Symmetry: D2
Subunit: 319 residues, 4 copies
């Protein structure tokens, strides 16, 4: 829309303007003959452009152009100064004081509406851009948190915080392809807590969760290369994909981890009283060929996991 605040001592100007603007529904008029209600009414009606007379009843017009740019409730409103006539410093001061125009009362009702229409409309879109900035900041900060949640949750196992299975499955599939392009050594650790049902059954399911937690922490601490990925494979089972790692490297890493767990010395009553939580690990490493399916790597790890288990638990074996 449009709203012009006129401010001028003489009713004869307030009238000319009122008349020029009657045949324009798009734009409304508001006369303010009392320069000591000027900024007040400016705040109240929310004008989109104000017209300011430079000489009034013993109150400097430029003093008011001062306040307009001074009070930030008006700071941004376009100001056309109405003068009689064309004096020097008073046109230069107009602008020094913040005026955006300096007009002689009055051009015809064409340039008058044009000029009004222009400044008004600019202010309007100034309001709009600011409004948009707000709304965008909101939406952007809604997607802000939306992104945290689905991430901490899509790809993370809540209990341990390690990656989850579907992240593992999908991550490992990616790494398989990367590996085959680079003819790189892709290694995989398959990790299981020994005698876990037995732990779960006399300590409690929560106590087992807490146990899983501590083991999950040790896993997270074994690997520390950008592409090392630790995951909860499924329940008591953990995995750990190690791109670019040799069989001997993987095994070394596996043994430091196994020792770590045992070393926490977590009380278990299996296989015998006095026992502490142990962990069996299957190691497996492959350089993928085209056409080869990543499941081969998993199977190899499970062979290793199965071997380690069938040779006394708490040990590492390559499948």
């Amino acid at each position: 829309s449009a709203m012009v605040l006129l401010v001028d001592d003489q009713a004869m100007i307030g009238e000319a303007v009122r008349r020029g603007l009657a045949g324009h529904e798009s734009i409304d008029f508001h006369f303010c003959a009392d320069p000591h209600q000027a900024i007040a009414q400016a705040v109240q009606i929310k004008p989109t452009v104000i017209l300011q007379d430079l000489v009034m009843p013993g109150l400097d017009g430029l003093t008011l152009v001062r306040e307009y740019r001074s009070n930030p409730l008006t700071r941004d409103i376009p100001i056309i100064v109405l003068s009689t006539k064309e004096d020097p410093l008073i046109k230069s001061a107009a602008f020094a004081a913040g005026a955006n125009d300096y007009l002689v009362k009055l051009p015809d009702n064409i340039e008058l509406v044009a000029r009004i229409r222009y400044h008004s409309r600019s202010y309007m879109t100034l309001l709009q851009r600011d409004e948009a900035y707000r709304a965008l900041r909101v939406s952007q900060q809604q997607l802000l948190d939306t992104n945290l949640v689905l991430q901490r949750l899509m790809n993370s196992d809540g209990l341990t915080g390690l990656s989850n299975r579907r992240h593992f499955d999908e991550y490992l599939e990616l790494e398989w392809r990367r590996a085959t392009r680079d003819q790189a050594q892709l290694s995989l650790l398959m990790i299981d807590v020994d005698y876990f049902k037995a732990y779960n059954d006399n300590f409690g399911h929560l106590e087992g969760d807490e146990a899983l937690r501590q083991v999950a922490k040790a896993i997270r601490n074994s690997c520390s290369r950008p592409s090392d990925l630790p995951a909860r494979y499924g329940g008591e089972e953990f995995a750990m994909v190690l791109p670019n790692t040799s069989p001997g490297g993987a095994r070394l890493l596996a043994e430091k981890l196994r020792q770590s767990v045992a070393g926490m010395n977590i009380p278990h009553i299996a296989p015998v009283p006095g026992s502490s939580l142990t962990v069996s690990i299957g190691v497996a490493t492959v350089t993928p060929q085209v056409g080869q399916h990543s499941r081969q790597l998993i199977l190899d790890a499970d062979k290793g996991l199965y071997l380690a288990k069938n040779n006394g638990r708490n040990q590492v074996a390559a499948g």
Copy 2:
């Protein structure tokens, strides 16, 4: 920033401007003496305000003010017309042709920069508001679909599409409170497919899912009041909360539904060969009192469900 395209036949004007603007890094200048590259260069440099001479080498200046407002690649760029001197229709035409100003070459380098600074800056924020409109439309349509997904998924059971359990639990809790304020009759249907393990075992788990589907559809068709809510309570179990429904009303609704299922005549081999899928229903209705826990309503439905089951299945009984 700021970019002024000057377009004027005389190098002496291109020079004055160039000079006025040298001591201003914020604003860059670009002279275009050839009015037959005017719009071309306008497109190329992306000016934020153009200054147009009205008389040039035998090419109407207002013809170019025409094109500027004509080509939408420039449509929105503020135009200050530079004239010599102040002729009549040529100021009125300035604006009729789209000009936003009409200046006499040249005011001092204060009003010249002021005026330039103003129009430039308005255009700038015109660009910004439009940019924001785009970005907001994107974000808003990201939350658009984001909302569909989590909704079709937070509150809906995928297989049947009925509400899910947590929606049921939470919805029923709400309705319990509404009911106790209104001392209204809150009814609940607890629905189970008879001999479902037996169905699942010789037809297949998928075939059972499809069976669940058809039953889920019938449930959805029994209730049709704004607050009626059908849910998959858990597996072979369905629920259906009926606010504002009498015991006799609930029972009537229960019997139409039970008949419906039986009537689909879905082949089952239990309890005997030749049988068709049946359904047992527990009815229960309560007017909640303060302090009373909604679990009472559920228990009552299960009594009914249990009774119906222990009296030959395929029937409705109030607990």
Copy 3:
């Protein structure tokens, strides 16, 4: 699979069994002639059924049946006692000690495998049910938290915690239908912070968010009936759907809220220095008719909101 631990002093029994079971790949055998490694090997091989001789080299067979049911690492393994011959208390003791069978060495290799096959297979599915219990508990507690997130997030505005817009839109649509069935009075509050751009601009966007927060809290405190719903309508705009509330009731509620906000006395510099954060509210209440679109209620609230605004802000007006 199947794994039988035999424990018997005489190699001649260990042999008969070994022989009976050779032609059965499904089932593996393990002889334990030394009753002082019995439970040890039981732990190591994870048998699915153990056969226990009642008399051995000076170590009571029933003492071992004691330990089997004693150590929980074996607690659940089925025990067939092998005796010679059929003595009294020794069959009754067999069971008193935990035995699940009492056989005479030896039935033919049909009943022997049958019996073994049965107990073994039961234990097997005992293991399976327990495994399933674990895995189900996991999945269920994954959907546990999955449900919190999408809920606290699908339907809640993060900043204020009030409902969000899409929840409002959808909730109000539901309540419209409920209302038209009950020919009930549905009221709606449309709430806006007065001079918010002005607040946002000199205090900071965060400070405005914090301002929004405090106002959001007051809203949440105005309504307290099961179906009252407070929402962030969009930015500086809040809504509040009040089912079953009279026009006069809605207005009363509106005025207590408006006073509350003003009373927090939150420093604003608009409309004038020394001002405190105020709020304009639009009230509107409808009894919905069939065919009537809920948008009518919203429009009525906005009329009220618009009126209140155009009469000095910080007030309530019915549209």
Copy 4:
């Protein structure tokens, strides 16, 4: 719980059992003297173990042991055969017919309850494991689809399907670290549609979305190595991270893509009538050093993007 179906011709046996089981609330009894309602009642009461007499009123007991294992509604129920006395093939047949025990009517009420308690309880947990299998299959297939949604949605831009910004930001951060370990050449393409506001404004926002779509498709087709990642950087901006790619390689890839877009020959009216949609691209490639921040790579791409733009659009330039 426990439910024994006895089936025997003589009431005197039905009585002994009834009596043995009265002092046991955990277990209920059900006598079936009419062998021609046997399976019928088996279906009706859902027994957890049935006791079967081998000789009855002119109806073979083993015929009924046949049906029990025959009808799958009973298939899994444990069967203790009650005989008088101990005949040969009739114990071997007992098992051949499916019996799980063969008892002489009757042992004392200790072994009788023991034996009953055992088979009953096994069946019970057979039911439980199956129940669990169902419930787990449900939960697992809820996480099934839950995973699709948040994935197709967390990491994918809906409109183009390319990765989104947060995936880009996070993916590129990962690749930066991988790159610095391998001292590998990490390249990045920054892609922008030339004159897009101009396209959006006279064709329509949807038409621009469709335009974005077609361009997004071409991008997706340029890169095809496991680690190449195409993303919508923000609105009209696209990105494309190319691990392990030389500056010259990146540029080659950039030029094939740019040509592709231009070649679709999508009608635009800018910069001039008759124009087709073009695209500007910034190329940049870095071998990351420790301590170096990935933002360097982005800046370099933007320099290139900026250069390309400030040299006529529709071209590739390295920043």
